Amino acid sequence: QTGYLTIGGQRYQAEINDLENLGEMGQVWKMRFRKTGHVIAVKQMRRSGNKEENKRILMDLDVVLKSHDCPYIVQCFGTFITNTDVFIAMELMGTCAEKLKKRMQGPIPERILGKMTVAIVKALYYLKEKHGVIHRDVKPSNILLDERGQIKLCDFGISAGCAAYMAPERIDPPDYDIRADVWSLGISLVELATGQFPYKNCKTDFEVLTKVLQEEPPLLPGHMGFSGDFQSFVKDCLTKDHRKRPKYNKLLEHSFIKRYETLEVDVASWFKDVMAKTE
Ligand SMILES: *CCC(=O)Nc1cc(C(=O)NCc2cn([C@@H]3CCCC[C@H]3OC)nn2)cc(-c2[nH]nc3ccccc23)c1
């Protein structure tokens, strides 16, 4: 089913000419539907593009299309197949978690990372159970937010990943990366909660790999007033031995995860305030 946009619950029989280009962002464009007025995200894939690049653009689209019942993954409205290109209509979000770290110029409050952690873990657990896919590249770049308070995962073309957020067993595998995304989430949490990257002063990709193995996991400092439930979640995610790393089924029952499921925090109001101070 191509040539149909499904924003909300309305199916629109439209073409690529019914979308106005509003400029490059993030080849993903910010485009505007002229028939209705919606502003959406359109990823353009050139047929004459790279085979390795395009093969990733169809892998994430394959699982994004089958992740329609997951509210923690960016949803694809439709697709436009012309004789030259392929246009993937993704929903429009505010920005990513990596860009939020630069706009903040400092740490992100724990209450925001709580709803973020609940959203990301459910996304990975949904991928491991419903479709049996692992992300293999979890980092702040793939954590999107919007002015409505929603937090979702973003395209996983490799479902090796980024060498900085690598898990210890994905570097020295004893012979399996079933729970290696748990470590990647932990490294991303320490980076956003402190503002600094945990493995600092590393000029080569091999240096972080040594510090991941040769040095104790980088935990959260105690003089920043972080919650006890939040510090134990980072310690469990950053367990060095892969065999003692908790599964996703045990993470959903953690005291920190269940704390921010029932608690309703205003991510929408906090997101509009930080993005207001632009450069
Ligand atoms: C980490 C890199 C990244 O996430 N880049 C990225 C940037 C944007 C972006 O800059 N969007 C700008 C934008 C924001 N708005 C809102 C909502 C519509 C009305 C105007 C604003 O509200 C006042 N409009 N444009 C966006 C994305 C992004 N968004 N959805 C994506 C899906 C898949 C990939 C990237 C997406 C990413």
Side-chain angles (χ1 to χ4, degrees), residues 2-10 12 14-34 36-42 44-50 53-54 56-98 100-101 103-127 129 131-135 137-157 159-174 178-199 201-202 204-243 245-246 248-257 259-263 265-276:
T2 179
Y4 280 88
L5 292 183
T6 315
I7 305 99
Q10 287 289 297
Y12 297 107
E15 60 187 10
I16 182 59
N17 298 333
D18 292 358
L19 288 173
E20 184 189 17
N21 197 328
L22 309 183
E24 185 189 4
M25 69 179 195
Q27 186 75 294
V28 49
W29 307 92
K30 171 183 173 179
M31 302 197 75
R32 165 179 164 270
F33 207 22
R34 297 210 220 87
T36 67
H38 294 88
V39 40
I40 65 177
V42 176
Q44 178 187 1
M45 163 194 162
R46 289 174 168 83
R47 176 183 175 181
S48 60
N50 178 28
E53 168 185 333
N54 290 11
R56 295 152 47 183
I57 307 182
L58 284 90
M59 182 58 184
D60 51 3
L61 174 60
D62 181 21
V63 195
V64 162
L65 288 175
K66 71 180 61 178
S67 302
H68 48 68
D69 53 355
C70 185
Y72 312 99
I73 298 180
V74 289
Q75 301 301 331
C76 181
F77 296 149
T79 171
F80 297 144
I81 300 180
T82 172
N83 199 272
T84 307
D85 306 319
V86 172
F87 295 90
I88 306 173
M90 297 292 186
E91 66 171 337
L92 205 283
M93 304 278 290
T95 185
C96 63
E98 180 190 21
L100 266 185
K101 194 189 69 174
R103 296 282 286 270
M104 278 289 304
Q105 298 191 30
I108 300 181
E110 181 194 328
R111 59 183 181 277
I112 299 298
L113 305 187
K115 282 284 188 175
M116 175 186 300
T117 305
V118 176
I120 301 306
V121 176
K122 282 208 182 73
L124 304 179
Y125 176 76
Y126 170 84
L127 292 178
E129 294 285 66
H131 309 309
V133 285
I134 62 176
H135 203 271
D137 204 26
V138 166
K139 46 182 178 177
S141 312
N142 299 84
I143 303 177
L144 304 186
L145 302 86
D146 57 352
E147 69 171 7
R148 302 172 54 188
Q150 284 185 325
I151 305 174
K152 302 184 182 185
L153 221 51
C154 173
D155 288 16
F156 24 77
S159 62
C162 197
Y165 310 89
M166 273 275 192
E169 75 276 9
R170 210 192 287 271
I171 308 303
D172 197 337
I178 172 179
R179 294 164 282 264
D181 302 328
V182 184
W183 175 280
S184 303
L185 176 70
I187 298 296
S188 300
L189 286 178
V190 185
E191 181 182 5
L192 298 177
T194 59
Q196 296 285 96
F197 191 82
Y199 301 103
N201 296 21
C202 294
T204 174
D205 276 359
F206 194 80
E207 188 163 344
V208 288
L209 306 184
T210 56
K211 287 181 172 57
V212 161
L213 302 180
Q214 288 189 346
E215 188 48 89
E216 214 66 9
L219 277 175
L220 306 170
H223 57 273
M224 293 188 59
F226 288 115
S227 171
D229 300 325
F230 180 49
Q231 298 194 46
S232 70
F233 191 89
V234 172
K235 174 183 289 294
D236 296 0
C237 288
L238 298 187
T239 46
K240 255 191 164 182
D241 192 59
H242 154 76
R243 330 182 198 94
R245 190 167 303 167
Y248 300 101
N249 189 23
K250 191 200 172 189
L251 290 183
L252 270 69
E253 295 161 340
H254 194 271
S255 60
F256 170 78
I257 287 294
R259 171 166 167 169
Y260 288 84
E261 297 184 29
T262 66
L263 181 62
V265 79
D266 199 333
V267 184
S269 300
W270 178 88
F271 185 83
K272 299 175 183 177
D273 201 315
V274 48
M275 296 297 296

